[PDB]
Design a protein around this ligand. Sequence first.
Ligand SMILES: CC(C)CCC[C@@H](C)[C@H]1CC[C@H]2[C@@H]3CC=C4C[C@@H](O)CC[C@]4(C)[C@H]3CC[C@]12C
Ligand SMILES: CC(C)CCC[C@@H](C)[C@H]1CC[C@H]2[C@@H]3CC=C4C[C@@H](O)CC[C@]4(C)[C@H]3CC[C@]12C
Ligand SMILES: CN(C)C(=O)N[C@H]1CC[C@H](CCN2CCN(c3cccc(Cl)c3Cl)CC2)CC1
Ligand SMILES: [Mg+2]
Length: 355
Amino acid sequence: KNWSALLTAVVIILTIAGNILVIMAVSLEKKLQNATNYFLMSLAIADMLLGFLVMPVSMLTILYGYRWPLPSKLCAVWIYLDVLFSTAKIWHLCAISLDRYVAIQNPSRTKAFLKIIAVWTISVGISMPIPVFGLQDDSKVFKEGSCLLADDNFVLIGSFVSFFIPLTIMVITYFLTIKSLQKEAADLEDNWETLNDNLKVIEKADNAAQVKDALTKMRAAALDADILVGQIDDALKLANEGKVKEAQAAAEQLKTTINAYIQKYGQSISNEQKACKVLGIVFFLFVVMWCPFFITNIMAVICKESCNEDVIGALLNVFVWIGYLNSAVNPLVYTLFNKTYRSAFSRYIQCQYKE
Ligand SMILES: CC(C)CCC[C@@H](C)[C@H]1CC[C@H]2[C@@H]3CC=C4C[C@@H](O)CC[C@]4(C)[C@H]3CC[C@]12C
Ligand SMILES: CC(C)CCC[C@@H](C)[C@H]1CC[C@H]2[C@@H]3CC=C4C[C@@H](O)CC[C@]4(C)[C@H]3CC[C@]12C
Ligand SMILES: CN(C)C(=O)N[C@H]1CC[C@H](CCN2CCN(c3cccc(Cl)c3Cl)CC2)CC1
Ligand SMILES: [Mg+2]
């Protein structure tokens, strides 16, 4: 008689339906066809595959008191799917953080589907000791007729190698991305005063000194931020001949090109900080929900002697569902914090699929 299967059946269908909707939204709606959204589909494939393959077998074992109810050579395989799909999500979340960072030092699907194939192959490579050695020796994958990783080298080596190369690189490249977008906003409303200051200088002017210097100083300050470089140069010639009343009126026709360009760049940055913050929640929820399973699984190995493994085991059976639930919640994040995903999901529920 088990309570727990009534709970766990919820988490599986949330996982399956939501991650299908994310897969559906990137496949269909054109305003999601960018490289960072191509990763989020691949992530959702992993979360949906976790929900189809790994999670109902976990529920099944809950209904046999953890005494493993299937063929023995499926235990080593099930473990490989359970580790792969998670190792897939951590190298996904690392890649997005890293790819958006290299995007800031810069001015395609084949961009993305090489990088996704690069990440999946580093997951398939890293998880591959499990069935190659587990299918040889049933005592890497079974303890006491319960299917679970029973090799501590695979846990210790896998956890740090598979989760601390990527987490480190993800938490550095997330932090540096925040600092790159803070310097860009700082550097742009620096150029605001420099251009704006100099406008008030050219409108006050007496002579061709105050106009030619203050368009020289406008031009280099324009060069830090395309088309307005010519429009300063189209007005830099008027002051050089001495046409001062003409260059002053040409500059209030620069004021409109300036206000138009600054706001567009400024909207783009405020977008990309809202977008950096959405991932940061996808990133934050992943660690925090796996955090109790992770720490306890490592302490299983560290205090084999000094601790009640019945209690340690009774928590791992509980803590692994906290991290399963993480599959369910990536889609909810998008629903409340993207207009684009919410509008799309709200039309797939109305069975209406034409952009
Ligand atoms: C371990 C194996 C047997 C599990 C099964 C993996 C299956 C479900 C995976 C692997 C390859 C995946 C497909 C690869 C690429 C695409 C194209 C994309 O535009 C829509 C989804 C779609 C069609 C994927 C759907 C899910 C998929 C079919
Ligand atoms: C009763 C006698 C034999 C002693 C048993 C001590 C056991 C039950 C103790 C010692 C080590 C402990 C674990 C150490 C680390 C963590 C991770 C953290 O998120 C809190 C829970 C958890 C998982 C603890 C639960 C209780 C624990 C398993
Ligand atoms: C950022 N942080 C800290 C992390 O990502 N931590 C990680 C914690 C471990 C997660 C691995 C996923 N599997 C491992 C194997 N598990 C298992 C399988 C069969 C039987 C039994 Cl009993 C068990 Cl317990 C279930 C979960 C990935 C994330
Ligand atoms: Mg000033």
